[PDB]
Amino acid sequence: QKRREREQHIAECMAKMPQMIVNWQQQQRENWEKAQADKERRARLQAEAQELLGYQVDPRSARFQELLQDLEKKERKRLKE
Amino acid sequence: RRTPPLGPMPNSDIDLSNLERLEKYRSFDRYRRRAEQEAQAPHWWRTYREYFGEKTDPKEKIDIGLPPPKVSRTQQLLERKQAIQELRANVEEERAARLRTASVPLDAVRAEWERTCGPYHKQRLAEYYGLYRDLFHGATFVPRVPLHVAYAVGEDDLMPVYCGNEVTPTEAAQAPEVTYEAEEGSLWTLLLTSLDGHLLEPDAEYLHWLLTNIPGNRVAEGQVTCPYLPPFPARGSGIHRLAFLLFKQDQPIDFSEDARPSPCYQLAQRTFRTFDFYKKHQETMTPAGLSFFQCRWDDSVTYIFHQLLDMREPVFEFVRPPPYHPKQKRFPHRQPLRYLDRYRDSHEPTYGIY
Amino acid sequence: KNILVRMVSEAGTGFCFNTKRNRLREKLTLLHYDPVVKQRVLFVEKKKIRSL
Amino acid sequence: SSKNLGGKSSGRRQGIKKMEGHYVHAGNIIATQRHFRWHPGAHVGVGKNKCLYALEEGIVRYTKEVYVPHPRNTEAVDLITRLPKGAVLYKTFVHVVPAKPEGTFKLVAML
Amino acid sequence: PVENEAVAPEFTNRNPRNLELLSVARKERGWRTVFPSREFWHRLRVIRTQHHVEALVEHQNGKVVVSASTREWAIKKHLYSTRNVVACESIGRVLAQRCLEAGINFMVYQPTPWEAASDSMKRLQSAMTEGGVVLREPQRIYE
Amino acid sequence: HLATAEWIAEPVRQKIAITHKNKINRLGELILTSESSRYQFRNLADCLQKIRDMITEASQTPKEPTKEDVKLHRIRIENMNRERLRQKRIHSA
Amino acid sequence: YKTKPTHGIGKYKHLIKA
RNA sequence: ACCUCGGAGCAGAACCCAACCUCCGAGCAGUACAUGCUAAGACUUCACCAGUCAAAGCGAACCUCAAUUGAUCCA
Ligand SMILES: [Mg+2]
Ligand SMILES: [Mg+2]
Ligand SMILES: [Mg+2]
Ligand SMILES: [Mg+2]
């Protein structure tokens, strides 16, 4: 009885897997594109600047990125209700 | 303690001064061409070419054949310049070349290859397969006249024997359709032998087909001094090589001491040797054509062993040497538990005196 | 800095294998060969057992 | 008073195990090394740790052949393109000239 | 006792093509750090001069078996611009035909990366495969 | 003798005669042998199980042949490129 | 080897000055 | 002051060789999760314990580094 139960559980887990496989790979592609989108966001706002390194330009870019992130969260909160 | 070299050191000819005014290898394939050029030279140190079985090749090999027909290379070169100039005149050829769409008439280049440079290629294929090594004990030649032998099985197609092809013995059931060019003053000896397939003798070979004094292109008119017999490679043995030979003789020479009885189904009689047979007829004839093909077992070979040869069919098998184990130690230190199973004969339980 | 985590299999149950992992990242989900089903199935990170 | 400390590591016993002419069965280790000294030739493979082991039963022969690197091996490719237009490299190679034929055809059944 | 039945219990086959047609002949394994690898029974080798293109098929002992080169008048008269891509495509077609007539239809092609990404070698490999000659020689048996 | 073996039915006797021709003697005997054990009981049992499995396998001609590619892929490509050389218009027998 | 006639056959850095 | 491991010199061309001799380092890190399973022949830090390479085979796509480490019992 417990052998049958184990083999039946293995059969059900094996049937339920290919959909888990494709869901996991789609989520892999999604977070990959999200990470690279964050890379291009951190690359866009540092463009406009004067001198020299990221002692001021990168902190201003991070401040504007924090403003944009808070704006996105506020847009989500307004969209909710 | 040193010892001086026995000759020139390899990178010594270049000068170590003025290095920046030397030309470097700007690429990888330039160095590759130079290195594979250099690896062919006879160096004085120890090399790969000395050890790995190159048969000690430098020794000139005897030619036994027809001479090359004399051509005037100046006229030929100017006419070929005329031809490629006439082809270069067309502009649709330039459009086809630029537009990546321009094929070749493969049958025309096939017949032209048979016409001009094909004999040398067939010579090196015949030397690769070891035909000149086993037919004339090393003596080589060129198949000067082209030859076309085609086999007959069904209704429409063909199965030709080109140089080195593979034809099954079912497709070699009957005599093939042999054709070639010849004048009406020449006599020919056809000869078909299998370089492998002799069972009792390692270095002999089986004569399957011999026609003598072929009057030119009349291949039917020759006297059947040995009747046609299909090939018979055994089962477990590998690929067997049959080879046709076409000789041109000056004067009509006859021989009955090599002739066979009309069935000729006793295998001791078909014990042939092309070296001795060419030794007997060394002066009257000269080899002019050559064709040969691979042959492996099919289910008609047991028919050949049954109703023609009247024997039981021998089968073979490709065995390997038994595996190597050291001398068995009494106390095998740190060997796994399966060490005892490498030296056991039967994997069944044994009970000595009980 | 790193951490050694146990991954458990989904199909062909009971099979586990351990692997290192960065600490600050999220938990793992991998493809691994499960020999009781003789295939590549999903594994899910569960019950970290080290701090290396 | 002995500021230096640490160099007490023992010798690795690396070197040639089979010289030229020694009969070698398949899988015998021919030479252990780090930082490639003898390069593998015909019927000789390499391990992860650059040891040389036979792949056939035969007799070891040491030769000196021209060295042509793999095209993706980028450091050796730039060392090749830095040579002048006549130089070639000649590293040392280890071969195993195999002794036994890989099989024979026996007569099993006469049916 | 029938006199036809002397079989001499070990059969000797002297065909050099034999054991590599039974897929049991040993390939020269190794060399493992240099290029090209010596693990083949036959190789495809193409030589690209600034004037002509020539393709060879070699055995690993070194003796060539078949070749198709634009220096030959047969291929020379039927095409234009022996250097260009369609000449190499013609060389591939003619070599595939010539080696099917030679009974050799397994060979290895081992190029540099920039040659394998070239259009000429791509169309030559395509002409070889569409001619019926397949690359990627089979495995040795009990390797 | 496989031809006059009356205890086996005719179509499966023909199917065994076709697909096991490599074990059929000159006189039509079907030669089976064994070398596994060192007691002749187990060798005889292995021979009889070979006969049983051959009979019960040949009668089920819906047996699905699973594709292998190590030893017959060579012969497949050789037969294909042997068929590529068939191009004439007239030949007989 | 150092005592053989082929000593220094694999010398290369006397060709590259860089 | 030191107690374990690795590289160079002493120890110049198979192996090995000490010093409270001279100099560097290490107690990690990084990427795949087949870093799956079995199996000829070997090397071995001068013993043992430990450590290292690996043909072929079943399956499946078509590993960097030098040291980077800890036996038994017991939990
Ligand atoms: Mg030391
Ligand atoms: Mg010491
Ligand atoms: Mg020891
Ligand atoms: Mg393996």
The CATH number for E89's domain is 3.30.420.80
Domain extent, residue E51, equals 6-143
Q: How far apart are the C-alpha atoms of A74 and F38, rounded to whole Å?
A: 85
Q: Domains of chain D: which residue ranges?
A: 5-111
Measure in Å the smallest separation between the Cα of G18 and chain B Cα atoms. Answer: 10
Element (H, E) at D95: strand D91-98
Residue B148 near residue B124, CB atoms below 8 Å:
no
Whose C1' is closest to the CA of D25: which nucleotide? Answer: H41
Residues 3-62 in D contacting G (C-alpha not used; CB under 8 Å): none
Contact B14 G3 (CB under 8 A): no
Instruction: Give how far Cα B86 sits from Cα of B89, D36, E80, Å.
Output: 5, 60, 11
As a dihedral over the C-alpha atoms of residue F2, residue F5, residue F7, residue F13, rounded to 10 degrees, the angle is: 40
Enumerate the residues of chain D whose CB falls inside 8 A of the CB of residue F31: 111
Q: How far apart are the C-alpha atoms of E77 and E61, rounded to whole Å?
A: 34
Residues 64-123 in E contacting B (C-alpha not used; CB under 8 Å): 64-67, 72-81, 84-86, 90, 93-94, 97-98, 101-104, 112
Residue D67 tokens read as 């060295």
Q: Which fold has domain D5-111?
A: OB fold (Dihydrolipoamide Acetyltransferase, E2P) (2.40.50)
Q: Domains of chain C: which residue ranges?
A: 1-52
Residue B326 near residue B158, CB atoms below 8 Å:
no
Enumerate the residues of chain D whose CB falls inside 8 A of the CB of residue F24: 111
Q: CA B337: distance to chain centroid?
A: 51
Kindly report the length of chain E. 143
Q: Hey, how many other C-beta atoms are within 10 angstroms of the C-beta on D25?
A: 13
The residues facing B316 across adjacent strands are D107
Contact E73 B268 (CB under 8 A): no
Contact B3 G7 (CB under 8 A): yes
- CB within 8 A of E23, min separation 6: which ones? E138, E139, E140, E141, F74
Of E11, E13, E33, nearest to D40 by CB-CB distance is E33
Closest CA to F75 of B79, B3, E105: E105
The burial class, CB within 10 Å (0-12 / 13-18 / 19+), for B117 is: middle
Instruction: Give how far Cα B201 sits from Cα of B117, B206, E2, Å.
Output: 37, 10, 17
Q: How many angstroms is it from E95 CA to the middle of ligand 3? A: 58
As a dihedral over the C-alpha atoms of residue B53, residue B55, residue B57, residue B58, rounded to 10 degrees, the angle is: 100
The residues facing B128 across adjacent strands are none
Q: Quickly give C16 CA vs H73 C1' distance in Å.
A: 27
Closest CA to B42 of B84, B6, B79, B2: B6
Measure in Å the smallest separation between the Cα of F70 and chain E Cα atoms. Answer: 8
Contact B202 E12 (CB under 8 A): yes
> How many domains does one find in chain E?
1
Instruction: Give how far Cα B95 sits from Cα of B83, B163, B293, D92, E90, Å.
Output: 19, 38, 43, 53, 17
Residue D97 near residue D59, CB atoms below 8 Å:
yes
Residue B311 tokens read as 């024997």
What residue is closest to H43 (Cα–C1')?
A: D29
Pairing, β C29-34 against β E53-59: unpaired
Q: How far apart are the C-alpha atoms of E93 and E102, rounded to whole Å?
A: 14
Query: In terms of CA atoms, which chain E residue is nearest residue F73?
Result: E138
Report the SS3 class of residue B234: coil
Taking the CA of residue B177 as centre, how many other CA atoms within 13 Å lie in the half-sphere pointing to its CB? Answer: 14
Q: Which fold has domain C1-52?
A: Rubrerythrin, domain 2 (2.20.28)
Q: How far apart are the C-alpha atoms of B31 and B24, rounded to whole Å?
A: 10
Q: How many angstroms is it from D45 CA to the middle of ligand 4? A: 13
Q: How would you label B65-85 residue by residue, b for 16+ Cβ within 10 Å and e otherwise?
A: bbeeeeeeeeeeeeeeeeebe
Q: How was this structure determined?
A: cryo-EM
Of D64, D85, D105, nearest to B22 by CB-CB distance is D85
The residues facing B114 across adjacent strands are none
Residue B278 tokens read as 């060419």
Largest CA distance in chain B: 101
Q: CA B189: distance to chain centroid?
A: 21
Q: CA E94: distance to chain centroid?
A: 13
Q: How far apart are the C-alpha atoms of A68 and B90, rounded to whole Å?
A: 68
Q: Does B184 touch chain G (CB under 8 A)?
A: no
Residue B246 tokens read as 């076409």
Phi-psi region of B44 (alpha: psi -120 to 50; beta: other; left: phi over 0): alpha
* Amino acid identity at A42: R
Q: How far apart are the C-alpha atoms of B27 and B31, rounded to whole Å?
A: 7
Residue in this structure with the two tokens 């290379």, named with its chain if needed: B73
Q: Quickly give F23 CA vs H2 C1' distance in Å.
A: 81
Interface test with F, best of E19, E105, E128, E141 (most F CBs within 10 A): E105
Q: Quickly give C21 CA vs H29 C1' distance in Å.
A: 13
Sheet with D29-31, strands from edge to edge, namely D29-31, D52-54, D44-46
* DSSP letter, residue B193: E
Residue B299 near residue F21, CB atoms below 8 Å:
yes
Q: Does D83 touch chain G (CB under 8 A)?
A: yes
DSSP strand E in B167-320: where? 177-179, 187-194, 205-215, 223-226, 240-249, 271-272, 285-295, 314-319
Residue B44 near residue B7, CB atoms below 8 Å:
yes
The burial class, CB within 10 Å (0-12 / 13-18 / 19+), for B271 is: middle
Element (H, E) at E114: helix E113-116
* Amino acid identity at F58: A
What is the secondary structure of D2-13 as a DSSP string?
-------PPP--
Residue B57 tokens read as 């090749």
Instruction: Give how far Cα B217 sits from Cα of B225, C13, E2, Å.
Output: 18, 80, 41
Residues B53, B55, B56: CA angle, nearest 5 degrees: 115
